[PDB]
Every structure is written in C-alpha cells, then in structure tokens.
Amino acid sequence: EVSQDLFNQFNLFAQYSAAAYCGKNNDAPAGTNITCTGNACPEVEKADATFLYSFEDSGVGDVTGFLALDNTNKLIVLSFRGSRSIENWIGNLNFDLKEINDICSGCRGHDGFTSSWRSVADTLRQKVEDAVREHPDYRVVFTGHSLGGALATVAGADLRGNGYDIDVFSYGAPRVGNRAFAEFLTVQTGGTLYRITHTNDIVPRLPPREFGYSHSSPEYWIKSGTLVPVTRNDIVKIEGIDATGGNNQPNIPDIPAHLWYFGLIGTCL
Amino acid sequence: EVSQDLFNQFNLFAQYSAAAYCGKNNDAPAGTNITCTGNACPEVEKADATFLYSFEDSGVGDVTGFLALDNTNKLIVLSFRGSRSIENWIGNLNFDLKEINDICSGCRGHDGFTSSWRSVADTLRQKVEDAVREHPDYRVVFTGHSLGGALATVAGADLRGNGYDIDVFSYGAPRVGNRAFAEFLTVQTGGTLYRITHTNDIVPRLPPREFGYSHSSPEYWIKSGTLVPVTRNDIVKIEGIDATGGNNQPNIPDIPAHLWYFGLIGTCL
Ligand SMILES: *[C@@H]1O[C@H](CO)[C@@H](O)[C@H](O)[C@H]1NC(C)=O
Numbered sequence A, B: 001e002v003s004q005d006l007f008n009q010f011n012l013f014a015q016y017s018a019a020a021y022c023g024k025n026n027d028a029p030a031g032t033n034i035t036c037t038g039n040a041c042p043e044v045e046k047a048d049a050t051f052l053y054s055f056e057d058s059g060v061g062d063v064t065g066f067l068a069l070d071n072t073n074k075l076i077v078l079s080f081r082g083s084r085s086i087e088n089w090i091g092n093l094n095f096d097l098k099e100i101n102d103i104c105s106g107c108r109g110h111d112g113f114t115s116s117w118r119s120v121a122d123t124l125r126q127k128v129e130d131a132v133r134e135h136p137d138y139r140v141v142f143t144g145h146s147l148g149g150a151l152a153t154v155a156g157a158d159l160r161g162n163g164y165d166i167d168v169f170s171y172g173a174p175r176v177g178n179r180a181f182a183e184f185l186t187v188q189t190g191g192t193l194y195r196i197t198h199t200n201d202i203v204p205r206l207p208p209r210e211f212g213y214s215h216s217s218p219e220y221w222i223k224s225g226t227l228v229p230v231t232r233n234d235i236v237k238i239e240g241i242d243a244t245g246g247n248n249q250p251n252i253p254d255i256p257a258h259l260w261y262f263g264l265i266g267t268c269l
C-alpha cells in the first residue's frame, strides 16, 4: 500500500513524537544527543540528532516539546508532546471553536489548541527560522502525537508559506477545527500533512463532528492491532474530508489503540 | 534456540500472567470468560477459558491473581499478579532470608514471598485440588510475572508431590532463596519450572547473589529487545545454577526491560 520510503518516514516521526514524552530531556542543553527510555525512539538515536531548543509548560497552554536538528536525515524537527494524562485530558476536553482568520479566512479552530499555539508561536517561529537559516537545505518537519499532533497541525497551517516547506506528521490527532479549516489543511501548498491514525483510536474521533468539527484529507490509517507490529500492507490511504472507513467508523473507540503507533507512544515504559 | 512447542507455551503463559494485571475483574463471577484490556492476552481470549476463582489482596502478603480453566488447551492455571507498582516494589524490596525446612532442607527462602505464599497456601491448594479432581487429565500450571513469578515458583515448590504434576512458568521472577533452594528448584520431581527472563531485566537480578541468593537452573533468556517481538530463535537456554551469560551479566540493568515478555506485561495500556 504505502511505499517503504514513506513507511520509514511514518516510523521515524512516530518516534520523534514518542520522544517528546520519553526523552530523557529538557533542562538538557542544546547540542545534547537525543535519547529515550524504554527503546521508545531507536531510529532517532541512530541519527546524529540533537536538541536545538527544549520547552516545558510554555505560555498559556503549558506547551511541551523540542526542536531538533538531524544531520543524518537532514531535518529540522519540531516535536510537540501530547498530554501527561491522556485519559483526564480527554475527560476535560472542551469543544469550543474560536475564530482564526489569521490562519485562513472563514476558519475556526478548537479554542485552546489555537490559543496554546498562538501563545508560543513567536518564540517557536523564531527558533525554527533560526534553524532554517543555519541549514537552508534541511527539510522542516513538525510532528506530534495526540494533543501534540494537534499543536503540530496548527503550528503548521500557521507557519506555512513563509518560504520554506513545512511537513506535518500527526499521530492520533484530534480534529482541530471547522469544515473551513479542514479544507485549507487538505489543499494548502508549501508542505504536506500526513495525518496518521490507528484502528479505533478514541482521540481522532474528538471533538465530534456534531460540535462543528471536520477532518482534513487524506488519512493514513493503520489497521494492525494494538501491540502488533506494522507493515506497509496494513497502512491504508483514505481520501475525502470527513471520510469514513478508516478511524472514523461507527464502533466503540479505545484508549489503548491511541497508544500504539508503530510502537509505544503517549507513554513510557 | 528453543523449540516451537516451548515457544508457544512460553507465549501462552506470558499472556495468562499478563491477564493477572489487565483482566477486567477480581470480583468477576466464577465461570465468566477471561478477557483483557489492550490486547494483553489474545491467546487466552482465543481459548475456551473461564475463571474458577478470583482472589485480591488475599492474606498477609496481599496476594492477587486467579485460577482458570482452559478447555481448549486442557489446563488448570493459577496466575499470580505482580505488584501494582513495580518501581516502588523494586525500591522497597526486602532482602531477608528465612528458614524453609518444610520444603527444602538447609534451604532458605525470601521472607516476604515465602510468608505471602504460606498465608494463602491452604485456600489455594484446596481450589487447585478441586479442579484436578474434576479434570483429572488437565495439566496444572502455576504462572506469574515479577512478584507473581516468585510466588508461583514458591507455590509450585510447595504443592508438588501430591500426585499431580505442577508446571511453573515464571516471567522476570526475582531470586527466591538460597543456594540450597536453587538446587532444590533445579532437581525437584513432579513438574518443570520454566524460568524466563528478558535481556537485562533488573528483577531477575534481585535480590543480589551478595545477599545469599541463588538462581535455579536452567534459565530461558529472551535476547530480543524491549518492544520487539519474540521468536523461538530469540530464546537461549542457559545451563547452571547462577549461570552468567544470560540475564546474569555484570552490565547494567533496566526497569523497562522488565515490562516486555513476548508482549506488554506488568502494566496495561
Ligand atoms: C552523540 O552522537 C554522536 C554521533 O551521532 C557521537 O559521535 C557522540 O559520541 C555522541 N555523544 C555522546 C555523549 O554520546
């Protein structure tokens, strides 16, 4: 189904995403090697990959994440950590939209994601711009799992078309806003969004459609089970704004499927 | 490096051992199907397997687990759960030996596992005997992970010789007593103890040899990594009491390598 190369990328960015939780990081100076506990990110550890900038509980939304430089793969990576307790995070999830014409006209995003981002966008934009200047050749990639996925997607849409492409790899992301925003996410030039999902993950199903939310297309849907290893065959590309038949299907969703994207994520052994 | 047949058994009882933590109910009526959250025990779910008796915090050691009937595999399974928080347990783990002449002569066992078993021995042995009666041709198997493994090893050594074989499958079990016990564990008749360890898992390294502890022979050492799938080619039988070159290496250990036996164990997604 998907290519080996695109598979390799899916796997690697699943890992930089997992590293935002299990990175033995932060309070860790720039230029330290990136390493995780619990074999959470061995492909990152194999790369000559290092922190550029770490943040923990930044701005209103208490954002957490790292900016990384990878000389092996030629990347600059912005990885957003999802929540420390996904369960309570999902419990307390608020479904309010807020306006964001700044990102695109007619667009409304989950208020809280957009707000948390907005609050750190100036620091982070500057940090990325600095790294793009130092390595104009390197590919810029934003990524995150869960809440992390959300922030990476928002930051993406916000920061694109300033000259450098920004690719986004998201794993188990919630919906981030209205149908207008979803449309912009599906066409927007200057980088690709790879929206990855697994089986019946609960997180991609929130906020629900009924509250005025849509998903971008396409969807990269993993169909091998929780704790099962992923092969190229399982991954199914799915087209259509709010298309069904991937993660968006009418059955009971699952918290454990949220924590298995290529390997363990959202939690550290 | 092990047989397929033995691989399959190791895998099945890793899952019964996982079910002791992830199976939804320690007040679930006898007779109900055995199931787990988070795909922790799909070979179990796949068998006609039911609860016979569920215990929780039982006796002085606060021992938890279940006894099951498996009509597909023709087994009677006693599964001991390890500690609800392994890092703490591992931290507040006492190293004192006690006399246990009742089982082994000149053999000293760990005080807490020994007393914990001893305090629930009578009820549990009654419940196994009842199942052995009703299903005389079923294999009796005691199994456990972590503390769970210590307990199954202790219970096995204690209840053998009553006319039914008891096989023991332990996962990441600590050392359970002194050199005499190790020997008594190596040779005892009336069943087989299958002592499975993983890479540089820390628990099988405790308590230390330097507190008078010895390990029974042999050892089934899983060499494949944390979050990596196990095949029969990844298990090596190591011969000798206190053999080195399996888990018993002078390298440094790891807590995570204690939560991955064939699959996720000792924690539930
Ligand atoms: C960081 O990794 C580089 C290459 O990826 C390696 O040469 C260097 O030894 C590492 N630094 C440390 C402290 O391990």
Ligand SMILES: *[C@@H]1O[C@H](CO)[C@@H](O)[C@H](O)[C@H]1NC(C)=O
Binding pocket: B033, B047, B048, B049
């Ligand atoms: C229990 O499993 C048996 C066979 O393994 C099955 O026939 C029966 O439907 C199950 N009971 C429930 C409540 O699922």
Ligand SMILES: O=Cc1ccc([N+](=O)[O-])cc1
Binding pocket: B003, B004, B005, B006
């Ligand atoms: O080939 C090794 C082997 C071991 C055990 C079994 N068996 O138990 O059936 C068969 C083969």
